[PDB]
Amino acid sequence: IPEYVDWRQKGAVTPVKNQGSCGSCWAFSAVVTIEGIIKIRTGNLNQYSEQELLDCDRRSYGCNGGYPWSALQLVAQYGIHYRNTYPYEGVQRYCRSREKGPYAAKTDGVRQVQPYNEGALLYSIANQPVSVVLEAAGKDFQLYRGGIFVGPCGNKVDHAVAAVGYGPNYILIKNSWGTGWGENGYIRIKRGTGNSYGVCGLYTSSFYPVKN
Amino acid sequence: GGLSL
């Protein structure tokens, strides 16, 4: 796999979003991967609905957190609407999928990346954006303004985001905290070192949609 | 799994 990958430059990443005062990161994370795989497979970049996952994936806990892989299975075994059709509200409400007409996109499944394995994660990223988790509770992550983030942090993951590229010293992550945080809403997290968990536990639990 | 800012 090459030294640089950046799905933004291939038109496979939509603008940075803001989950606001709702623990819906898991839904944002899943949607980034869906937006990515749809562009790669069909040539169209669309925005898909985090709100639908928030309201409809009842294995997850709405604004109290949830599971990217559970969200991704919903899209494959049910489907997902466009963001325009089912926009983000920042509060969990009833599932309105039926009320909003047929799905816009469907996936053919979900796969997990081999955990605690930097190359496996990079190989996956070279193929498509990947949902990843990390520890975000530390002030260092919260206050990140730019540069290669090395921590300090532990491995107690609590935040779902999406990896959309990498380069020699980093993995490039799209966060859902608005465009003021980090590097225009992104973070470059240090990679390469002697760390099987990854910086901030980045290699703990990573998924991607399958299509088509 | 998974934070608000």
Short mmCIF file of N, CA, C and O in Angstrom, two decimals, chain A residues 90-194:
data_model
loop_
_atom_site.label_atom_id
_atom_site.label_comp_id
_atom_site.label_asym_id
_atom_site.label_seq_id
_atom_site.Cartn_x
_atom_site.Cartn_y
_atom_site.Cartn_z
N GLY A 90 -29.86 16.24 16.76
CA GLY A 90 -29.08 16.29 18.01
C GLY A 90 -29.84 15.79 19.24
O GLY A 90 -29.41 16.04 20.37
N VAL A 91 -30.97 15.13 19.01
CA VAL A 91 -31.77 14.52 20.07
C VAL A 91 -32.39 13.25 19.50
O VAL A 91 -32.81 13.22 18.32
N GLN A 92 -32.47 12.18 20.29
CA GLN A 92 -33.06 10.96 19.78
C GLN A 92 -34.59 11.13 19.77
O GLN A 92 -35.19 11.55 20.75
N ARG A 93 -35.20 10.74 18.65
CA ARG A 93 -36.64 10.78 18.48
C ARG A 93 -37.07 9.40 17.97
O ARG A 93 -36.27 8.44 17.89
N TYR A 94 -38.32 9.25 17.60
CA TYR A 94 -38.77 7.98 17.09
C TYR A 94 -38.19 7.71 15.70
O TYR A 94 -37.82 8.64 14.94
N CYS A 95 -38.10 6.43 15.36
CA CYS A 95 -37.60 6.01 14.09
C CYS A 95 -38.62 6.38 13.04
O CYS A 95 -39.75 5.92 13.12
N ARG A 96 -38.19 7.21 12.08
CA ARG A 96 -39.05 7.72 11.02
C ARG A 96 -38.71 7.15 9.62
O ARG A 96 -39.17 7.67 8.60
N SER A 97 -37.96 6.05 9.57
CA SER A 97 -37.57 5.45 8.29
C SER A 97 -38.75 5.14 7.39
O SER A 97 -38.71 5.39 6.20
N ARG A 98 -39.81 4.57 7.96
CA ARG A 98 -40.98 4.19 7.16
C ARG A 98 -41.69 5.40 6.59
O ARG A 98 -42.13 5.38 5.43
N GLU A 99 -41.77 6.45 7.41
CA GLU A 99 -42.47 7.70 7.09
C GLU A 99 -41.76 8.49 5.99
O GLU A 99 -42.35 9.36 5.34
N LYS A 100 -40.48 8.20 5.78
CA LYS A 100 -39.68 8.96 4.84
C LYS A 100 -39.40 8.27 3.52
O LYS A 100 -38.50 8.68 2.78
N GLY A 101 -40.19 7.25 3.20
CA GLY A 101 -40.12 6.61 1.90
C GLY A 101 -38.99 5.61 1.81
O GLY A 101 -38.35 5.30 2.82
N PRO A 102 -38.76 5.05 0.60
CA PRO A 102 -37.75 4.00 0.50
C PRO A 102 -36.33 4.52 0.80
O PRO A 102 -36.05 5.70 0.60
N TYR A 103 -35.50 3.61 1.29
CA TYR A 103 -34.08 3.90 1.54
C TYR A 103 -33.37 4.50 0.30
O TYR A 103 -33.82 4.34 -0.84
N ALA A 104 -32.28 5.21 0.54
CA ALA A 104 -31.50 5.83 -0.53
C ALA A 104 -30.32 4.95 -0.92
O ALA A 104 -29.86 4.95 -2.07
N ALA A 105 -29.80 4.23 0.06
CA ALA A 105 -28.62 3.40 -0.13
C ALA A 105 -28.68 2.20 0.77
O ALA A 105 -29.25 2.23 1.87
N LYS A 106 -28.08 1.12 0.30
CA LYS A 106 -28.03 -0.09 1.07
C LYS A 106 -26.64 -0.63 0.88
O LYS A 106 -26.03 -0.43 -0.18
N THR A 107 -26.15 -1.28 1.91
CA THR A 107 -24.88 -1.96 1.83
C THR A 107 -25.16 -3.45 1.78
O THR A 107 -26.29 -3.89 1.99
N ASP A 108 -24.13 -4.21 1.42
CA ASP A 108 -24.24 -5.64 1.32
C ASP A 108 -23.64 -6.35 2.53
O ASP A 108 -23.54 -7.56 2.51
N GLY A 109 -23.22 -5.59 3.55
CA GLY A 109 -22.66 -6.15 4.80
C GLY A 109 -21.70 -5.25 5.59
O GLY A 109 -21.51 -4.09 5.23
N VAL A 110 -21.15 -5.80 6.68
CA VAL A 110 -20.12 -5.16 7.51
C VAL A 110 -18.97 -6.13 7.79
O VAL A 110 -19.18 -7.32 8.01
N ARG A 111 -17.74 -5.63 7.75
CA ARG A 111 -16.61 -6.43 8.17
C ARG A 111 -15.80 -5.71 9.22
O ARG A 111 -15.73 -4.47 9.24
N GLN A 112 -15.23 -6.48 10.13
CA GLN A 112 -14.26 -5.96 11.08
C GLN A 112 -12.80 -6.07 10.62
O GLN A 112 -12.40 -7.08 10.03
N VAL A 113 -12.02 -5.01 10.89
CA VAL A 113 -10.55 -5.04 10.75
C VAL A 113 -9.89 -5.91 11.85
O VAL A 113 -10.26 -5.86 13.02
N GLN A 114 -8.85 -6.67 11.50
CA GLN A 114 -8.11 -7.38 12.54
C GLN A 114 -7.64 -6.40 13.60
O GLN A 114 -6.95 -5.42 13.27
N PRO A 115 -8.03 -6.59 14.87
CA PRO A 115 -7.65 -5.61 15.90
C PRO A 115 -6.17 -5.58 16.30
O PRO A 115 -5.44 -6.55 16.04
N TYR A 116 -5.77 -4.46 16.92
CA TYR A 116 -4.43 -4.24 17.49
C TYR A 116 -3.32 -4.49 16.47
O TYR A 116 -2.28 -5.09 16.79
N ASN A 117 -3.56 -4.03 15.25
CA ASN A 117 -2.76 -4.38 14.10
C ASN A 117 -2.74 -3.18 13.15
O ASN A 117 -3.66 -2.97 12.35
N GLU A 118 -1.68 -2.38 13.26
CA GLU A 118 -1.55 -1.16 12.47
C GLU A 118 -1.64 -1.41 10.96
O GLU A 118 -2.40 -0.72 10.26
N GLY A 119 -0.89 -2.38 10.43
CA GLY A 119 -0.95 -2.66 9.00
C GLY A 119 -2.34 -3.04 8.49
O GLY A 119 -2.73 -2.66 7.38
N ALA A 120 -3.06 -3.85 9.27
CA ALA A 120 -4.42 -4.25 8.92
C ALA A 120 -5.34 -3.04 8.80
O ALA A 120 -6.09 -2.94 7.82
N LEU A 121 -5.21 -2.13 9.76
CA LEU A 121 -5.98 -0.86 9.72
C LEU A 121 -5.56 0.00 8.52
O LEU A 121 -6.42 0.47 7.75
N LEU A 122 -4.25 0.18 8.31
CA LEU A 122 -3.81 0.92 7.14
C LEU A 122 -4.26 0.29 5.82
O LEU A 122 -4.61 0.99 4.84
N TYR A 123 -4.21 -1.05 5.74
CA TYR A 123 -4.59 -1.72 4.51
C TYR A 123 -6.08 -1.44 4.21
O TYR A 123 -6.50 -1.26 3.08
N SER A 124 -6.84 -1.44 5.28
CA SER A 124 -8.28 -1.19 5.16
C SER A 124 -8.52 0.24 4.70
O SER A 124 -9.27 0.49 3.74
N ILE A 125 -7.83 1.18 5.34
CA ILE A 125 -7.94 2.59 4.95
C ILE A 125 -7.55 2.80 3.49
O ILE A 125 -8.15 3.63 2.80
N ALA A 126 -6.54 2.07 2.99
CA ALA A 126 -6.18 2.23 1.59
C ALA A 126 -7.29 1.81 0.65
O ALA A 126 -7.32 2.20 -0.51
N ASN A 127 -8.22 0.98 1.15
CA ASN A 127 -9.37 0.54 0.35
C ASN A 127 -10.64 1.42 0.50
O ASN A 127 -11.37 1.61 -0.45
N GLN A 128 -10.81 2.00 1.67
CA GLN A 128 -12.02 2.80 1.99
C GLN A 128 -11.95 3.39 3.41
O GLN A 128 -11.19 2.92 4.26
N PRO A 129 -12.72 4.48 3.67
CA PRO A 129 -12.78 4.96 5.03
C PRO A 129 -13.25 3.90 6.04
O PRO A 129 -14.12 3.07 5.72
N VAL A 130 -12.74 3.99 7.26
CA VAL A 130 -12.94 2.96 8.27
C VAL A 130 -13.40 3.61 9.57
O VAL A 130 -12.93 4.69 9.93
N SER A 131 -14.40 3.01 10.21
CA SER A 131 -14.85 3.45 11.50
C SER A 131 -13.87 2.94 12.54
O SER A 131 -13.59 1.73 12.56
N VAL A 132 -13.41 3.83 13.41
CA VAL A 132 -12.43 3.54 14.47
C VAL A 132 -12.84 4.17 15.78
O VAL A 132 -13.66 5.12 15.84
N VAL A 133 -12.28 3.67 16.86
CA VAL A 133 -12.56 4.21 18.17
C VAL A 133 -11.27 4.67 18.85
O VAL A 133 -10.17 4.18 18.51
N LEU A 134 -11.41 5.58 19.80
CA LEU A 134 -10.25 6.11 20.56
C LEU A 134 -10.65 6.70 21.91
O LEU A 134 -11.83 6.92 22.21
N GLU A 135 -9.67 6.92 22.78
CA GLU A 135 -9.94 7.62 24.01
C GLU A 135 -9.86 9.13 23.80
O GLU A 135 -8.77 9.67 23.51
N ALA A 136 -11.01 9.80 23.97
CA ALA A 136 -11.16 11.24 23.75
C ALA A 136 -11.38 12.07 25.02
O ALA A 136 -11.49 13.30 24.93
N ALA A 137 -11.46 11.42 26.18
CA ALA A 137 -11.76 12.11 27.44
C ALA A 137 -10.65 13.02 27.96
O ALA A 137 -10.92 13.95 28.73
N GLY A 138 -9.41 12.76 27.55
CA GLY A 138 -8.30 13.56 28.05
C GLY A 138 -8.36 14.99 27.53
O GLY A 138 -8.81 15.22 26.39
N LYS A 139 -7.91 15.95 28.32
CA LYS A 139 -7.85 17.35 27.90
C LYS A 139 -6.99 17.50 26.64
O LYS A 139 -7.22 18.39 25.87
N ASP A 140 -5.97 16.65 26.47
CA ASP A 140 -5.06 16.79 25.32
C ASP A 140 -5.80 16.57 24.00
O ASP A 140 -5.64 17.34 23.04
N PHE A 141 -6.63 15.54 23.96
CA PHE A 141 -7.47 15.33 22.77
C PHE A 141 -8.53 16.44 22.63
O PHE A 141 -8.77 16.94 21.53
N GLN A 142 -9.19 16.80 23.72
CA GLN A 142 -10.25 17.82 23.66
C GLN A 142 -9.74 19.15 23.17
O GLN A 142 -10.45 19.88 22.46
N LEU A 143 -8.51 19.47 23.53
CA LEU A 143 -7.93 20.77 23.26
C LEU A 143 -7.03 20.79 22.02
O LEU A 143 -6.43 21.83 21.70
N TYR A 144 -6.94 19.65 21.32
CA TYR A 144 -6.13 19.54 20.10
C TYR A 144 -6.56 20.58 19.08
O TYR A 144 -7.74 20.70 18.79
N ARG A 145 -5.58 21.31 18.55
CA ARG A 145 -5.74 22.45 17.63
C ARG A 145 -5.07 22.20 16.28
O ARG A 145 -5.18 23.02 15.37
N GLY A 146 -4.29 21.14 16.18
CA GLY A 146 -3.49 20.88 14.98
C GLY A 146 -2.14 20.26 15.27
O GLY A 146 -1.67 20.28 16.42
N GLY A 147 -1.54 19.69 14.23
CA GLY A 147 -0.27 18.98 14.32
C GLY A 147 -0.48 17.48 14.42
O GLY A 147 -1.61 16.98 14.35
N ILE A 148 0.62 16.74 14.55
CA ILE A 148 0.54 15.32 14.77
C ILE A 148 0.33 15.06 16.25
O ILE A 148 1.21 15.32 17.07
N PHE A 149 -0.85 14.54 16.57
CA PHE A 149 -1.22 14.26 17.95
C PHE A 149 -0.61 12.96 18.45
O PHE A 149 -0.80 11.90 17.89
N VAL A 150 0.17 13.07 19.53
CA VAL A 150 0.87 11.89 20.04
C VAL A 150 0.28 11.44 21.36
O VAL A 150 0.73 10.44 21.94
N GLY A 151 -0.75 12.15 21.81
CA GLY A 151 -1.27 11.99 23.16
C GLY A 151 -0.78 13.18 23.97
O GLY A 151 -0.56 14.26 23.41
N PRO A 152 -0.55 12.98 25.28
CA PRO A 152 -0.75 11.76 26.04
C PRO A 152 -2.21 11.30 26.08
O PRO A 152 -3.12 12.13 26.02
N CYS A 153 -2.38 10.00 26.13
CA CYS A 153 -3.70 9.38 26.29
C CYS A 153 -3.53 7.93 26.70
O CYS A 153 -2.46 7.33 26.49
N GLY A 154 -4.59 7.36 27.27
CA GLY A 154 -4.64 5.91 27.50
C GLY A 154 -5.34 5.15 26.37
O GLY A 154 -5.49 5.66 25.26
N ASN A 155 -5.77 3.91 26.67
CA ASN A 155 -6.34 3.00 25.67
C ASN A 155 -7.81 2.67 25.93
O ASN A 155 -8.36 1.73 25.33
N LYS A 156 -8.43 3.43 26.84
CA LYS A 156 -9.80 3.21 27.26
C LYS A 156 -10.77 3.96 26.33
O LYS A 156 -11.25 5.06 26.62
N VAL A 157 -11.03 3.33 25.21
CA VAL A 157 -11.75 3.99 24.11
C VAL A 157 -13.15 4.50 24.57
O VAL A 157 -13.82 3.89 25.41
N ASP A 158 -13.60 5.63 24.02
CA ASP A 158 -14.87 6.23 24.45
C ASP A 158 -15.45 7.14 23.38
O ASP A 158 -16.34 7.95 23.66
N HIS A 159 -14.91 7.02 22.18
CA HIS A 159 -15.24 8.00 21.13
C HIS A 159 -15.08 7.34 19.80
O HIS A 159 -14.04 6.78 19.51
N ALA A 160 -16.11 7.39 18.97
CA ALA A 160 -16.11 6.81 17.66
C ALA A 160 -15.95 7.92 16.61
O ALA A 160 -16.68 8.93 16.62
N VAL A 161 -14.99 7.67 15.74
CA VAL A 161 -14.65 8.58 14.63
C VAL A 161 -14.39 7.79 13.34
O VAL A 161 -14.68 6.58 13.29
N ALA A 162 -13.86 8.44 12.30
CA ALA A 162 -13.61 7.69 11.06
C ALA A 162 -12.24 8.01 10.50
O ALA A 162 -11.83 9.17 10.43
N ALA A 163 -11.53 6.97 10.07
CA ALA A 163 -10.22 7.19 9.45
C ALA A 163 -10.43 7.32 7.95
O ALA A 163 -11.04 6.46 7.32
N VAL A 164 -9.92 8.41 7.38
CA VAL A 164 -10.13 8.71 5.97
C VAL A 164 -8.82 8.84 5.20
O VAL A 164 -8.83 9.23 4.04
N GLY A 165 -7.70 8.48 5.84
CA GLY A 165 -6.40 8.54 5.18
C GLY A 165 -5.27 8.28 6.14
O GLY A 165 -5.49 7.96 7.31
N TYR A 166 -4.05 8.40 5.61
CA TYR A 166 -2.85 8.24 6.43
C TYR A 166 -1.67 8.78 5.63
O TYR A 166 -1.76 8.99 4.40
N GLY A 167 -0.58 8.98 6.34
CA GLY A 167 0.70 9.32 5.71
C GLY A 167 1.82 8.77 6.57
O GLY A 167 1.57 8.06 7.54
N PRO A 168 3.06 9.15 6.26
CA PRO A 168 4.21 8.61 6.98
C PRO A 168 4.16 8.60 8.50
O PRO A 168 4.55 7.60 9.11
N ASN A 169 3.67 9.66 9.12
CA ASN A 169 3.70 9.66 10.57
C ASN A 169 2.35 9.70 11.23
O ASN A 169 2.29 9.89 12.43
N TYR A 170 1.26 9.53 10.45
CA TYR A 170 -0.08 9.70 11.03
C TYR A 170 -1.17 8.87 10.33
O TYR A 170 -1.02 8.41 9.20
N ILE A 171 -2.29 8.73 11.05
CA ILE A 171 -3.56 8.33 10.46
C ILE A 171 -4.47 9.58 10.53
O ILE A 171 -4.50 10.31 11.54
N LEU A 172 -5.17 9.83 9.42
CA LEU A 172 -5.99 11.02 9.28
C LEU A 172 -7.42 10.63 9.65
O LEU A 172 -8.00 9.73 9.03
N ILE A 173 -7.97 11.35 10.62
CA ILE A 173 -9.27 11.06 11.25
C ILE A 173 -10.23 12.23 11.04
O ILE A 173 -9.86 13.39 11.33
N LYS A 174 -11.46 11.91 10.61
CA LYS A 174 -12.55 12.88 10.56
C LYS A 174 -13.32 12.79 11.86
O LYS A 174 -13.90 11.72 12.16
N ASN A 175 -13.27 13.84 12.67
CA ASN A 175 -14.07 13.92 13.89
C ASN A 175 -15.42 14.62 13.62
O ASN A 175 -15.61 15.21 12.53
N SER A 176 -16.32 14.55 14.60
CA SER A 176 -17.67 15.11 14.47
C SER A 176 -17.93 16.17 15.54
O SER A 176 -19.02 16.22 16.16
N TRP A 177 -16.92 17.02 15.76
CA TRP A 177 -16.98 18.10 16.77
C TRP A 177 -16.98 19.48 16.11
O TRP A 177 -16.72 20.47 16.77
N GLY A 178 -17.34 19.51 14.82
CA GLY A 178 -17.39 20.80 14.15
C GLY A 178 -16.05 21.16 13.54
O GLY A 178 -15.02 20.51 13.79
N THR A 179 -16.05 22.21 12.73
CA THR A 179 -14.83 22.52 11.97
C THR A 179 -13.81 23.36 12.76
O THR A 179 -12.68 23.55 12.27
N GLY A 180 -14.18 23.86 13.94
CA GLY A 180 -13.26 24.63 14.80
C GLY A 180 -12.28 23.74 15.56
O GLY A 180 -11.21 24.18 15.96
N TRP A 181 -12.66 22.50 15.79
CA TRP A 181 -11.79 21.59 16.53
C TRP A 181 -10.70 21.04 15.62
O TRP A 181 -10.96 20.75 14.47
N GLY A 182 -9.49 20.87 16.16
CA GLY A 182 -8.42 20.20 15.43
C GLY A 182 -8.01 20.94 14.16
O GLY A 182 -8.03 22.18 14.11
N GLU A 183 -7.68 20.18 13.14
CA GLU A 183 -7.27 20.73 11.84
C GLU A 183 -8.51 20.75 10.98
O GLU A 183 -8.77 19.81 10.22
N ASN A 184 -9.27 21.84 11.10
CA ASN A 184 -10.52 21.98 10.32
C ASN A 184 -11.47 20.81 10.55
O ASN A 184 -12.26 20.47 9.69
N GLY A 185 -11.44 20.26 11.76
CA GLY A 185 -12.36 19.19 12.17
C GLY A 185 -11.75 17.82 12.12
O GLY A 185 -12.38 16.86 12.54
N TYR A 186 -10.54 17.74 11.56
CA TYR A 186 -9.75 16.51 11.45
C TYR A 186 -8.65 16.44 12.51
O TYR A 186 -8.25 17.44 13.09
N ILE A 187 -8.14 15.23 12.71
CA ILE A 187 -6.94 15.05 13.54
C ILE A 187 -5.99 14.08 12.84
O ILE A 187 -6.41 13.10 12.21
N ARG A 188 -4.69 14.41 12.91
CA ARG A 188 -3.68 13.48 12.44
C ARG A 188 -3.09 12.85 13.67
O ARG A 188 -2.42 13.54 14.46
N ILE A 189 -3.37 11.57 13.85
CA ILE A 189 -2.88 10.86 15.03
C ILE A 189 -1.60 10.10 14.72
O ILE A 189 -1.52 9.37 13.75
N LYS A 190 -0.59 10.25 15.57
CA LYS A 190 0.68 9.61 15.33
C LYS A 190 0.50 8.10 15.10
O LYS A 190 -0.29 7.43 15.81
N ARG A 191 1.21 7.55 14.13
CA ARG A 191 1.26 6.11 13.93
C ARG A 191 2.73 5.68 13.84
O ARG A 191 3.62 6.53 13.80
N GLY A 192 2.93 4.37 13.76
CA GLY A 192 4.22 3.81 13.37
C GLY A 192 5.04 3.27 14.52
O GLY A 192 5.79 2.30 14.35
N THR A 193 4.88 3.88 15.69
CA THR A 193 5.67 3.55 16.87
C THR A 193 5.52 2.07 17.31
O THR A 193 5.02 1.24 16.55
N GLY A 194 5.97 1.74 18.52
CA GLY A 194 5.89 0.35 18.99
C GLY A 194 4.66 0.07 19.84
O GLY A 194 4.78 -0.46 20.95
#
